Amino acid sequence: PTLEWFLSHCHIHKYPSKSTLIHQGEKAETLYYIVKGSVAVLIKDEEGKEMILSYLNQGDFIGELGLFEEGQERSAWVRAKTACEVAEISYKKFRQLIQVNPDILMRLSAQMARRLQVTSEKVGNLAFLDVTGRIAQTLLNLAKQPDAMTHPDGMQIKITRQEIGQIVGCSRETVGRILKMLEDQNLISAHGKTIVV
Amino acid sequence: PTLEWFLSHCHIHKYPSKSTLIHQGEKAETLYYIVKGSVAVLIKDEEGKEMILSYLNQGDFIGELGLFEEGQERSAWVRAKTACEVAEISYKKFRQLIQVNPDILMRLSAQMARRLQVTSEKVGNLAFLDVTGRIAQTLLNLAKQPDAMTHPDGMQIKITRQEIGQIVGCSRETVGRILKMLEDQNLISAHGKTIVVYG
DNA sequence: GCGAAAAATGCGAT
DNA sequence: CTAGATCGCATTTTTCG
DNA sequence: CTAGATCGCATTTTTCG
DNA sequence: GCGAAAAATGCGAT
Ligand SMILES: Nc1ncnc2c1ncn2[C@@H]1O[C@@H]2COP(=O)(O)O[C@H]2[C@H]1O
Ligand SMILES: Nc1ncnc2c1ncn2[C@@H]1O[C@@H]2COP(=O)(O)O[C@H]2[C@H]1O
């Protein structure tokens, strides 16, 4: 619709399965717009480990956190999860775009409000829950949002235990030791591809 | 300027220290703008624990995360830390003050801008750092906000060991038990209040 | 600027 | 193995009439 | 106490030409 | 739409 004026005012780039869409700490002067696919958002800790703050997808503005005050630079890594096509465009341009139309400012603004929410619940989650109850939370959230292939008795996921650990905050060998517990209990199913029965 | 206009249509109220401005859960439909004083945004889980996602001062907007979708709930309690002056409009109303002047829709979104970058880091200090690290990062965090009186060396923050905990996630005990030595380490000294960078 | 009362802290071996 | 979490109510420490 | 973390490497599983 | 190659897993006494 309105978001139609934008799409054809930006570019279409190509990034394969693993390219790092944007890197931490590098003066933000352009916002991406995932056309097809899904990137993942991550910050890391001195010793090297990563944590997956979020999983953006098909139609989510990216790297916006700075279109509002020059002098800023990245705050997280974004590496394409699948095959992603990103709609590139500078901040200034995009800016003079808003003066033409307002509506388009009223879109991501939301996007960045829905995240401010979720993330609060991640702190709500990381501090009010022990790893078990957190893996349960994270499986549901992945049984939700797209890509979760339907299955006979529920939704199906495709994620590595090593990976769960990152969204959550625990170690490789607990995520998987928990999944077995859940497995045994009959809450889900497991095999490199888990089903959240 | 582009705000006196914004306050033009904006019933304004004076809330007293410690008053609940907003309930986490309640149906959301009104915006707010703090023209004086300051609040604190906090979440709390059923067994009774609480957390401080942040403190909000003058110029800050509050309860604006339901402003984009019809039918959200207020995502967290907000309680005046002092006596505030708060202006309100009403969602439906705001949306109109936008079409006619989309600028007032900017300032706000550049706020959340930051708020997201910030609350984001909360998540990262929490899963990455130890209670200590998170106190060291908390002391400085506060040591530089609208209320840090200048001490000959560094400055004088004013806080209780329990606020810290709420901001950190650990206990009333472990905080001090963890503050004593951080003091013996000789970077700061406490006693009812604390001074950052030697005292 | 003095109190009584309301709050905020400290203990530690599990 | 290690970081923190805890509980009953005695104390400093703070608030404001 | 009690929830979680580690490490070196045989197996398994999943990925990529 | 096979297979070597490259990643993810499972173990526990501490
Ligand atoms: N908590 C979050 N939830 C979702 N997306 C985020 C979050 N934090 C950062 N990002 C995204 O990651 C991007 C990294 O670059 P920017 O800081 O430009 O903008 C950031 C956002 O688009
Ligand atoms: N993570 C956060 N950081 C700062 N403020 C927040 C956060 N989460 C919620 N809030 C604020 O608290 C308000 C609670 O109600 P709303 O969701 O309407 O709007 C929310 C924001 O104004």
Side-chain angles (χ1 to χ4, degrees):
Chain A
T2 70
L3 178 275
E4 262 299 20
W5 98 296
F6 182 75
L7 305 154
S8 307
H9 213 283
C10 317
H11 305 316
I12 311 297
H13 291 359
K14 279 291 179 168
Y15 292 68
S17 213
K18 179 51 199 70
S19 40
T20 307
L21 278 54
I22 66 165
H23 283 97
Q24 167 158 68
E26 300 197 3
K27 295 165 179 51
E29 200 63 11
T30 169
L31 63 147
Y32 307 52
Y33 183 82
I34 296 175
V35 167
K36 160 255 165 179
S38 86
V39 322
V41 198
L42 43 73
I43 46 181
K44 310 182 166 197
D45 112 88
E46 297 291 19
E47 267 69 344
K49 183 87 163 176
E50 312 174 304
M51 173 149 92
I52 299 186
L53 277 196
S54 159
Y55 271 113
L56 276 355
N57 304 298
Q58 175 197 147
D60 265 326
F61 283 98
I62 301 179
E64 2 81 347
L65 290 190
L67 91 84
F68 285 114
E69 234 304 288
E70 200 53 53
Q72 264 78 313
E73 81 275 73
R74 303 295 151 191
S75 48
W77 282 260
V78 184
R79 110 183 61 183
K81 183 161 66 175
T82 319
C84 259
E85 307 191 8
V86 306
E88 254 271 0
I89 168 175
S90 90
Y91 287 154
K92 223 166 305 168
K93 263 275 173 54
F94 171 78
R95 209 166 313 174
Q96 177 184 275
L97 295 187
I98 304 178
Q99 174 171 291
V100 196
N101 193 313
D103 192 86
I104 198 62
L105 180 68
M106 273 275 292
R107 202 168 271 62
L108 76 175
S109 51
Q111 275 189 157
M112 77 169 327
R114 192 67 271 139
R115 308 179 190 178
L116 196 341
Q117 270 153 302
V118 176
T119 295
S120 315
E121 202 198 296
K122 211 178 187 70
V123 184
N125 259 52
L126 274 148
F128 294 137
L129 248 28
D130 69 308
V131 153
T132 279
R134 232 184 304 164
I135 293 151
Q137 283 303 294
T138 346
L139 280 185
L140 294 205
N141 293 154
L142 311 182
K144 224 101 56 45
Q145 41 98 269
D147 120 70
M149 281 155 253
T150 61
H151 159 292
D153 49 52
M155 310 294 91
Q156 175 181 199
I157 297 299
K158 230 298 188 61
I159 198 150
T160 58
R161 297 165 173 61
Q162 177 159 273
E163 167 108 11
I164 293 189
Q166 286 190 178
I167 296 182
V168 191
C170 44
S171 64
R172 208 188 81 214
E173 40 234 316
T174 308
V175 158
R177 165 182 295 124
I178 304 301
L179 266 17
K180 255 276 196 318
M181 170 178 245
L182 286 174
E183 166 71 285
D184 188 53
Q185 261 190 310
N186 269 54
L187 259 9
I188 53 182
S189 194
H191 180 70
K193 92 266 188 169
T194 134
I195 317 298
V196 181
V197 180
Chain B
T2 161
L3 37 71
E4 330 199 30
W5 166 71
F6 164 58
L7 234 72
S8 155
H9 344 64
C10 221
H11 310 285
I12 97 84
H13 295 256
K14 313 286 174 51
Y15 298 70
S17 211
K18 289 190 194 58
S19 45
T20 306
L21 280 58
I22 306 158
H23 271 305
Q24 180 204 298
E26 155 93 316
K27 238 63 178 53
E29 55 170 312
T30 172
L31 202 77
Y32 290 82
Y33 180 91
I34 313 197
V35 326
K36 161 230 298 178
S38 49
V39 298
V41 202
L42 70 151
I43 39 166
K44 61 185 297 75
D45 118 289
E46 299 82 37
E47 239 64 278
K49 270 284 60 177
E50 305 198 326
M51 184 122 197
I52 300 302
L53 287 173
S54 166
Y55 293 132
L56 251 32
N57 311 140
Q58 197 184 324
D60 291 324
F61 269 81
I62 13 182
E64 39 57 73
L65 256 50
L67 187 257
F68 300 82
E69 296 175 58
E70 214 57 324
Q72 254 95 272
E73 309 205 321
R74 299 298 222 190
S75 57
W77 264 279
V78 177
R79 181 187 50 159
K81 206 180 179 179
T82 61
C84 318
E85 219 200 292
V86 180
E88 50 190 57
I89 339 72
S90 69
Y91 280 21
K92 277 175 174 172
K93 223 316 139 54
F94 202 65
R95 283 159 198 155
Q96 260 159 278
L97 291 167
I98 286 166
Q99 312 309 326
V100 159
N101 178 180
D103 181 41
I104 186 69
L105 211 180
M106 282 288 275
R107 203 169 301 185
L108 189 163
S109 307
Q111 291 207 325
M112 297 181 273
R114 181 86 48 278
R115 299 171 167 188
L116 185 166
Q117 310 170 184
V118 187
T119 278
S120 192
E121 198 175 61
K122 201 69 162 194
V123 197
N125 287 184
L126 241 176
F128 285 157
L129 321 163
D130 37 294
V131 88
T132 290
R134 288 180 276 131
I135 289 179
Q137 269 300 133
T138 289
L139 269 1
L140 161 162
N141 206 58
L142 276 186
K144 48 110 185 65
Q145 213 190 306
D147 89 327
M149 277 57 55
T150 93
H151 175 287
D153 27 289
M155 52 230 272
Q156 185 172 69
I157 265 298
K158 166 87 86 56
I159 208 80
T160 87
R161 262 161 289 281
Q162 283 186 180
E163 272 254 62
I164 304 269
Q166 291 186 310
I167 298 183
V168 158
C170 76
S171 66
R172 45 217 176 188
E173 301 87 40
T174 305
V175 151
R177 285 151 37 152
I178 284 292
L179 197 58
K180 229 301 166 308
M181 62 90 37
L182 208 64
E183 178 212 45
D184 291 347
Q185 198 145 309
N186 314 314
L187 210 182
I188 62 87
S189 275
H191 175 275
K193 80 291 183 60
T194 304
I195 297 95
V196 45
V197 176
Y198 189 44

